[PDB]
């Protein structure tokens, strides 16, 4: 009674037995599927903790041992005396990697074992928090040879408020409301842009103004910190054979660092644990630049290309979008900044699936997010059936602190 | 009542119609199986309850719920099943059920058209030659010299005991798939099987990679018999490119009529194992999936070499550039041949409008996001940013086992 999962390109068949271990419940029922929705104490802290400790001791091939039973006993003793417990350094590293390994919407998981874990659980103030973040950005950027990383700030604990990064990513561009009712810059960042200004940021008026950080230490208001210009590696966009493209003045940044998600490990919660990888080119070309509710450049590019935008059957949108993606891949390669195209990325994710099937007997994967937003069926993940479910450790969404 | 958001515009709606969904799907709170193509697998007390449900909505759809023959029609079906074990549908019920089954198909992006459907009633057919003639009137009517019209032909319902009418081909028009001393296929690899069944039932094979297969039609109980399609009934389109002069020399073609002939129409508890339906193509079905899938004609590499694309590195997006032009050549060729076709932008835009109508009419719409979003340029179309609820309503088209 485990789901049978077929690849329709090749004919292979597997069964996802890992799904029967799904340590939480999602939004679907036998009556209706909600798979496409974007947003779907001591004794229970104890069972989450015991399950994680069991996982950790499996991964080091030491399950059911003395050191294993001791650690379980230590944990339930700590939860008795304090209502919580502290992870050892090696458990934190393993926990952070599993949460990446368990993220069902991430197509980059072939890399999950190569993660640099920075332990900032001794962090003390917003100012120290800024220092750790700058170090993260600089290590992860690495002059364009990007490295995956996560920095873990102190956990949620009773008595004190949370560390929070108010920005959804460490690097985002401002979005300024206009007189047209329109938006200058990134429309997805209007809210954080207004928050910054009302916390004392002098706004610019460009389309690619990098936003300051809003950092919150426990029981403190958020504090504003400017990122040093030379810390934020950016890439001017040009096209290899459409020379007018460089005159659009488009740019994107090197480092995708998500900073507003909650990291859950063995019952414990880290509301501030930003992590970074490297971009897949369609994130920039298709979503960030062509979405009508983002920079929405697609029709402007198509007009410049002398495509017939009068009629949809010329496929002018598909043509413009492929060329924007080409420009993205060419610009990053030219600037020597790590980037992966959706063909290579999905191919390596197929290898991840085969790796995971041998290791854990399955892989949580969200088909609608794994399949790229252009050229879906040209990639191998399109013809691969998938089973979505929630494993822990996990990265979870959390409400905005404001 | 599930909250459903459109992320492109910000609108929010509630799918109250999902509450009235019955036949359970494959998902559970612990794991989602929405991406699976065939979910799970494939005392006449049950027949009455389904029969009375179907009758009730029929009379709600014509206002007349409340006294009148509405009261009356519930009785005849009661009596008919009490006497015979099955029942027969009144002709307007069969039309209404056929339309609703289409309206309820969660994977269909063309449902804006659900009201305009021609229903050919072939329930009095009792022969294989009769089926064949019924099929040909359909193909002729549906094709209509290239001005395609949606049509379904309903053959007699399955009766308890004694066999089924059935069409063996998955579609009325399919291209041959021939193996060889390479293990590879010439023709359509998706139809390797039904060609095997075509030859072993007495068919003479063909030349190359665009040979229209014969129909394997099966009257109840006695084995299927071959039927050869008249060429002038099979409108095909040869594929050319508006500016790439060499594309035509590649020798590709596709047929005009997508007519599905292996699904089971279920109305009011009755099951019709032979009810072939047809509409018209979205161009990505031909360009992207039929011609470009690695397990189909797989032409993508050949078109890239002719375009002089850099096939040495994935990062040139040569696959994406070649695929767009194939689609452009499909749209162009069908327009030149005055054959009805629709691009994935127009189709998805119409489907958004269908979603809004259905919100007003029934308070929701079953939609399978992974099949509604086109296989190319997905996020460039409005359905991409539209959350959708998938569930089973009746009347419905279902998949069914193959007859071997
Ligand atoms: C190294 C290269 C990486 C690539 C190419 C990559 C790629 C992606 C992509 C394309 C998405 C979907 C986003 C979208 O389409 O809107 C995603 C989601 C996600 N990624 Fe990865 N990623 C990488 C590294 C990482 C790392 C290092 C982490 C954390 C340790 C991570 C965690 C996640 C999570 C949690 C999600 C889901 C976020 C959500 O559900 O909203 N990724 N990734
Ligand atoms: C009139 C123009 C029509 C268009 C453009 C259209 C388009 C489509 C497309 C693109 C699919 C997805 C198939 C795939 O890519 O695998 C589909 C599926 C389907 N269509 Fe439509 N179709 C049309 C008419 C019809 C009609 C007339 C009927 C029935 C009377 C119908 C019933 C279905 C069903 C039952 C499915 C599969 C649903 C499922 O598997 O749950 N369609 N259609
Ligand atoms: C480490 C990493 C590397 C990479 N290369 N890529 C990444 C993309 C995301 C990502 C996560 C959630 C997202 O979405 C959240 C959201 C909020 C509101 C509405 N829709 C969606 C999006 C963009 N969709 C991207 C997260 C991490 C990424
Ligand atoms: C009336 C109509 C019009 C149109 N314009 N288009 C249509 C496409 C399909 C259709 C239904 C099921 C399908 O899938 C069957 C299948 C078999 C094996 C593996 N997976 C899936 C496919 C192709 N995917 C197309 C059905 C009807 C269509
Ligand atoms: C409504 C829709 O399901 C939603 O906007 C999803 C669809 N699939 C996606 N897939 C990826 N990779 N990224 C996304 O942001 C989305 N958005
Ligand atoms: C594995 C995957 O779910 C499967 O290949 C589906 C995905 N979506 C699809 N969507 C359409 N329209 N047609 C298809 O054949 C498929 N294939
Ligand atoms: Cl981004
Ligand atoms: Cl087809
Ligand atoms: Gd040029
Ligand atoms: Zn589901």
Swiss-Prot record, chain B:
<feature type="binding site">
    <location>
        <position position="289"/>
    </location>
    <ligand>
        <name>(6R)-L-erythro-5,6,7,8-tetrahydrobiopterin</name>
    </ligand>
</feature>
<feature type="binding site">
    <location>
        <position position="371"/>
    </location>
    <ligand>
        <name>(6R)-L-erythro-5,6,7,8-tetrahydrobiopterin</name>
    </ligand>
</feature>
<comment type="similarity">
    <text>Belongs to the NOS family.</text>
</comment>
<comment type="function">
    <text>Produces nitric oxide (NO) which is implicated in vascular smooth muscle relaxation through a cGMP-mediated signal transduction pathway. NO mediates vascular endothelial growth factor (VEGF)-induced angiogenesis in coronary vessels and promotes blood clotting through the activation of platelets.</text>
</comment>
<feature type="binding site">
    <location>
        <position position="290"/>
    </location>
    <ligand>
        <name>L-arginine</name>
    </ligand>
</feature>
<feature type="binding site">
    <location>
        <position position="281"/>
    </location>
    <ligand>
        <name>L-arginine</name>
    </ligand>
</feature>
<feature type="binding site">
    <location>
        <position position="285"/>
    </location>
    <ligand>
        <name>L-arginine</name>
    </ligand>
</feature>
<feature type="binding site">
    <location>
        <position position="171"/>
    </location>
    <ligand>
        <name>L-arginine</name>
    </ligand>
</feature>
<feature type="binding site">
    <location>
        <position position="384"/>
    </location>
    <ligand>
        <name>(6R)-L-erythro-5,6,7,8-tetrahydrobiopterin</name>
    </ligand>
</feature>
<protein>
    <recommendedName>
        <fullName>Nitric oxide synthase 3</fullName>
    </recommendedName>
</protein>
<feature type="binding site" description="axial binding residue">
    <location>
        <position position="108"/>
    </location>
    <ligand>
        <name>heme b</name>
    </ligand>
</feature>
<feature type="binding site">
    <location>
        <position position="27"/>
    </location>
    <ligand>
        <name>Zn(2+)</name>
    </ligand>
</feature>
<feature type="region of interest" description="Interaction with NOSIP">
    <location>
        <begin position="31"/>
        <end position="404"/>
    </location>
</feature>
<feature type="binding site">
    <location>
        <position position="280"/>
    </location>
    <ligand>
        <name>L-arginine</name>
    </ligand>
</feature>
<feature type="binding site">
    <location>
        <position position="370"/>
    </location>
    <ligand>
        <name>(6R)-L-erythro-5,6,7,8-tetrahydrobiopterin</name>
    </ligand>
</feature>
<feature type="binding site">
    <location>
        <position position="399"/>
    </location>
    <ligand>
        <name>heme b</name>
    </ligand>
</feature>
<comment type="subunit">
    <text>Homodimer. Interacts with NOSIP and NOSTRIN. Interacts with HSP90AB1. Forms a complex with ASL, ASS1 and SLC7A1; the complex regulates cell-autonomous L-arginine synthesis and citrulline recycling while channeling extracellular L-arginine to nitric oxide synthesis pathway.</text>
</comment>
<feature type="binding site">
    <location>
        <position position="35"/>
    </location>
    <ligand>
        <name>(6R)-L-erythro-5,6,7,8-tetrahydrobiopterin</name>
    </ligand>
</feature>
<feature type="binding site">
    <location>
        <position position="32"/>
    </location>
    <ligand>
        <name>Zn(2+)</name>
    </ligand>
</feature>
């Amino acid at each position: 009674k485990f789901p049978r999962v077929k690849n329709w390109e090749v004919g292979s068949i597997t069964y996802d037995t890992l799904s029967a271990q799904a340590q939480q419940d999602g939004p679907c029922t036998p009556r209706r599927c909600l798979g496409s929705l974007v947003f779907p104490a001591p004794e229970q802290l104890l069972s989450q903790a015991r399950d994680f400790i069991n996982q950790y001791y499996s991964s080091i091939k030491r399950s059911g041992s003395q050191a294993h039973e001791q650690r379980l006993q230590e944990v339930e003793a700590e939860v008795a005396a304090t209502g919580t417990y502290q992870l050892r350094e090696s458990e934190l590293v393993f926990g952070a990697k599993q949460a990446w390994r368990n993220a069902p919407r991430c197509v980059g998981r072939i890399q999950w074992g190569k993660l640099q874990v920075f332990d900032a659980r001794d962090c003390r103030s917003a100012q120290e928090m800024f220092t750790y973040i700058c170090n993260h950005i600089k290590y992860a950027t690495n002059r364009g040879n990007l490295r995956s990383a996560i920095t873990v700030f102190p956990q949620r604990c009773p008595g004190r408020g949370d560390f929070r990064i108010w920005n959804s990513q460490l690097v985002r561009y401002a979005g300024y409301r206009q007189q047209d009712g329109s938006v200058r810059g990134d429309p997805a960042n209007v809210e954080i842009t207004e928050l910054c200004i009302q916390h004392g940021w002098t706004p610019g008026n460009g389309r690619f103004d990098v936003l300051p950080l809003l950092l919150q230490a426990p029981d403190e208001p958020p504090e504003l910190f400017l990122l040093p210009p030379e810390l934020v590696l950016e890439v001017p966009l040009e096209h290899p054979t459409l020379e007018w493209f460089a005159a659009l003045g488009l740019r994107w940044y090197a480092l995708p660092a998500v900073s507003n998600m909650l990291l859950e490990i063995g019952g414990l919660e880290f509301p501030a644990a930003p992590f970074s990888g490297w971009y897949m080119s369609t994130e920039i070309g298709t979503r960030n630049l062509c979405d009508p509710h983002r920079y929405n450049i697609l029709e402007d590019v198509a007009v410049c290309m002398d495509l017939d935008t009068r009629t949809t059957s010329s496929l002018w949108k598909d043509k413009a979008a492929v060329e924007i993606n080409v420009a993205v891949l060419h610009s990053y390669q030219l600037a020597k900044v790590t980037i992966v195209d959706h063909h290579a990325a999905t191919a390596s994710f197929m290898k991840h699936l085969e790796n995971e099937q041998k290791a854990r007997g399955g892989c949580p994967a969200d088909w609608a997010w794994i399949v790229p937003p252009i050229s879906g069926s040209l990639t191998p993940v399109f013809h691969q059936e998938m089973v979505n479910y929630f494993l822990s450790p996990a990265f979870r969404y959390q409400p905005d602190p404001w």
